[PDB]
Design a protein around this ligand. Structure first.
Ligand SMILES: COc1ccc(Cc2nccc3cc(OC)c(OC)cc23)cc1OC
Ligand SMILES: COc1ccc(Cc2nccc3cc(OC)c(OC)cc23)cc1OC
Lengths: 145, 145
């Protein structure tokens, strides 16, 4: 089992497009900072970012290089990791965030698409829980009106 | 975030229908046993089961009552938990296993569909990892020919 995908999906009581705009532009207790740049398309408007993150996951300090892009039409954010501690375990590591209206608020889906270096590599449950708790935190700071 | 779904999806080098038949009818190192019954449809043939499991998850002994059904046409197995330790955290807890051919072997998807009792409940990452490791183990004991 070298290629796979982990997903956390959560219902949120918020219009999909509004929630997407919140996620696209947004905890201090988790140690983290980044340096990097913004990327533009051609009309001079920012379309994404390339960031080098320094962070602490489950007590351990790590770095990652991440390129973020977005698709407003499908309310999708994509984080493509090119370098860093996670690349000791994964040949490929991408995080896709989608927000959609409930067929019925919204459903938010975080998917971690991965390919392991070898069979001794773990699947990224640590990252799934980290992103899940981050999105639960953010969502509990949002309310109607 | 009270209603959600966790997923682990893995690629396997096996025909979908064959892999489904293997999963449908299949580690001793994990402490577990069950008692219970088989369920029939009307032609007298077994269509499912109702089992009371006794097991140890992350060192802790637990019980669960599980009703399993299957859909051969869609290669889907469904495990519906009605009682047990997990129901201290979840109002609803269902595990859905799907096997499909790669649009290209197969893709196996384990989904845990849950509703928490309250916001203090955890999301079932412990169960996701347990089912993931179980399916990785099983799949590493299967080879071509
Ligand atoms: C190795 O995997 C990653 C590691 C760090 C990041 C950085 C990152 N991207 C998006 C949202 C984030 C949100 C975070 O919490 C505020 C955070 O702290 C480490 C990092 C975040 C992304 C990663 O994949 C998207
Ligand atoms: C609380 O959640 C559950 C707890 C136990 C089970 C029992 C079960 N069902 C299917 C496959 C299993 C496979 C297991 O490993 C061999 C196992 O050991 C506890 C239990 C299994 C299912 C559960 O949900 C499907």
């Amino acid at each position: 089992g070298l290629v796979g995908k982990l997903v956390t999906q959560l219902e949120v009581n918020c219009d999909a497009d509004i929630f997407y705009k919140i996620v696209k532009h947004h905890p201090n207790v988790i140690p983290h900072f980044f340096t990097g740049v913004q990327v533009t398309k051609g009309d001079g408007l920012v379309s994404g970012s390339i960031k080098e993150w320094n962070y602490v996951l489950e007590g351990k300090a790590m770095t990652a290089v991440e390129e973020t892009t977005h698709a407003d039409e499908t309310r999708t954010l994509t984080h493509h990791i090119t370098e860093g501690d996670a690349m000791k375990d994964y040949k490929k590591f991408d995080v896709i965030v989608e927000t959609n209206p409930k067929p019925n608020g919204s459903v938010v889906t975080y998917s971690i698409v991965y390919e392991k270096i070898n069979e001794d590599s773990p699947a990224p449950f640590d990252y799934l829980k980290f992103f899940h708790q981050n999105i639960v935190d953010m969502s509990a700071h949002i309310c109607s009106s």
